[PDB]
């Protein structure tokens, strides 16, 4: 879904993201803040940004009106491919032209992106040392991340809520690199005694 869906942002960050990284016609979808778990289409038109609410009924998606769809992606495809079907109060047409990609949280090499728990356990045991760590995306809680650490291998969920990064609680961090740097210096302790030392990175190989 990364080509157009941004799970950890807000209307405000979607605005900024569309106005900096985007062009007129650029759009993204995101969770709703005014009614979870609806979704929201944020769209850039003629230098400004408009937010459109998507209803989540459990059996379909729609725009509180109009056609209904099995998936969010089908709804988005529909309004990309049928022009004039999306009109403001003034009757101005809203055009969904260019999906804005969800960028990776960092460009450091210990970030592996899409990667499973098991793939992380393999790479780390058969190519890392004790205290070898990486960060990856969470498949159990999409939108979140995971710190994968050689010690056996331990996985720690990294929550991303409102652009903040924490390790389940404790200090919220600005960027994913702040959280990693901070926990190298000051090791975290799992609640079974084990200290998760981040000793050396296991970088991606390409």
């Amino acid at each position: 879904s990364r080509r157009w869906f941004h799970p950890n942002i807000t209307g405000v960050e979607a605005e900024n993201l569309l106005l900096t990284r985007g062009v007129d016609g650029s759009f993204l979808a995101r969770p709703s803040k005014s009614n979870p778990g609806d979704f929201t289409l944020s769209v850039r038109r003629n230098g400004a940004v408009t937010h459109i609410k998507i209803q989540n009924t459990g059996d379909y998606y729609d725009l509180y009106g109009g056609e209904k769809f099995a998936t969010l992606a089908e709804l988005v495809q529909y309004y990309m491919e049928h022009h004039g079907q999306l009109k403001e109060k003034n009757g101005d047409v809203i055009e969904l032209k260019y999906p804005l990609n969800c960028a990776d949280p960092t460009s450091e090499r210990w970030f592996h992106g899409h990667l499973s728990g098991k793939e992380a356990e393999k790479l780390l045991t058969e190519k890392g040392k004790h205290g070898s760590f990486l960060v990856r995306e969470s498949q159990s809680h999409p939108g979140d991340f995971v710190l994968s650490v050689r010690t056996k291998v331990t996985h720690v969920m990294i929550r991303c809520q409102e652009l903040k990064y924490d390790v389940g609680g404790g200090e919220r961090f600005d960027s994913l690199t702040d959280l990693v740097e901070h926990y190298k210096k000051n090791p975290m302790v799992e609640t079974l005694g084990t200290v998760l030392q981040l000793k050396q990175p296991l970088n991606t190989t390409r």
């Binding site: 509180y64 999306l86 403001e88």
Partner: peptide, 7 residues
Amino acid sequence: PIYATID
């Protein structure tokens, strides 16, 4: 931060 409606 303004929303919209289509209908």
